[PDB]
Copies of this chain bind each other. A is one copy, B any other.
């Protein structure tokens, strides 16, 4: 059993049948989102009712629906009609990716724009880009995708090298009308290729790297039971998978002697946004919610042994729905392994003569996804000493434009005539805290400087302070790297042996948050991304910092709406949302394919244990 087990191919086919028989899955319907619902609070005495939540899109434009289905009983529990002009459009479907390019290929404004630039339509790729919400009054209630063009010179060519600037199209994918074709001027299409597998670009391959062999003679130290339940060096957890969020960790706990102590109830990356900083109207509207608009889990890669994942790997192969409700297995979509992590603790003592050295290790659960030109690896780490860590790895090909003659304040030049507009990748981690159980609170810790004076006559003293966040209206926080600011999640009703409330300290990377003007559409639609830390009271339906239907929604859904409830968070069931991101001014070294850059955060035990928890590690 386990009410936390991964969705099976059978459950997904059951959802399909159930929907099909209740009349909700006609020829014109598409599954836009499908995932398992988590167990409600309490509810632990009751046997599984496996439920699935489903967004049904209608290609004719009739109303979409949100449907909840019980798989154990074979019934629709509810179906609600969606007013998308109110609550937002449905996520972008894989099959809609093509539709932008095909619709445009017969539009005469588009054909004429290509003809002016001497581009063969059969060689012109169109990226299917989400819309946002700007000043275009005809777009309200229309399902829109925007289109930017890239030239592919041949089947295996990297079209990203050949952007067609000065030209953008807006397209109603439902009515199949091109609503606008905006041409602001021809710009040369950058000429050089970006084919990073072409010997002409690689030059001769290095023969100098000798193999590194990583093996585990006696197998790994972790177990997997029930399909997805891990135990490893005192840690216990379940590894979930959602087509929108990707890997999601459930019931993170740590064995302290006799007791299994809970730390985090659910951890996920609940949204991520890529806002572009170029004020040209070709691009000034682009802001991709890869998570909320495109759904990152659906494009999770199959990870190749010795290539994506090196060493003794245990795979999970999550199953998702396609657009028709058929199960699709993502084979080896999640890697799980343990690795050596250097020195954990070391001391050679001058008085005892004892020399002591122990090594560290971490458990790694990861996947890797691809959304158009980006690729992102999501990695969770658990260490021996109780630390939890997340890390995002951003690679792929940068999104390109022309580089204007006489330069730019908003774009980098990567190759002759080729630009890469400035942008950010900003993630939100939603951490439903359970530090020794659900009664938690958050404190903001600052370092406190002290003035030389009485009490401090040498002027060496320094201290720190902690401020409990008591209500949601005062739980919207910014980083302050100058005063070493962190946030402690404690349990005021579980004390360690020194009679202090047990806790975990969140260490942020303190990177810039959203740069856009606060009056922008993006600052409203991705308000989560303007502050580094938010604390909300737990509620079942408060899932994403951006709300449930991100595509084309007007603003303030999600975290600003939740926080407006101004609920008690002081010693309550609470959820922490940490914003963290990369601000990317691309470099020549990022072209034609980019070296991984990274960002993340970590949580460390802060008086959680009664002493170091790693004294029982052997040499």
Contact = CB atoms under 8 A, between A and B. Distances in A.
Given A346-B368, A385-B595, A482-B510, 5 more contacts: A158-B349, A212-B214, A213-B216, A345-B593, A462-B515
Nearest to A201: B615
Contacts of A450: 277, 279, 517
Given A221-B208, A452-B517, A612 B593 contact: yes
B516 A460 contact: yes
Q: Taking chain A's interface residues, is the majority helix, strand, or loop, or is none over half, making it mixed?
A: loop
Copies of this protein chain in the complex: 2
B353 A155 contact: yes
10 contacts: A158-B349, A203-B616, A205-B618, A207-B618, A209-B221, A210-B218, A346-B368, A416-B498, A452-B517, A591-B612
Given A221-B209, A349-B158, A449-B515, A481 B479 contact: yes
B343 A395 contact: yes
Contacts of A134: 458
Contacts of A482: 479, 481, 510, 512
B301 A452 contact: no
A460 B611 contact: no
Contacts of A338: 212
Nearest to A383: B595
A42 B350 CA distance: 44
Contacts of A406: none
B353 A409 contact: no
B211 A217 contact: yes
A155 B257 CA distance: 30
A543 interface: no
Contact of A354 (B156, B209, B463, B619): B156
Contact of A611 (B219, B257, B307, B591): B591
A377 B611 contact: no
A278 interface: yes
Interface stretch (A171-179, A467-475, A519-527): A519-527
A451 B498 contact: no
Contacts of A310: 340, 359
Interface string A562-589: 0000000000000000000001010111
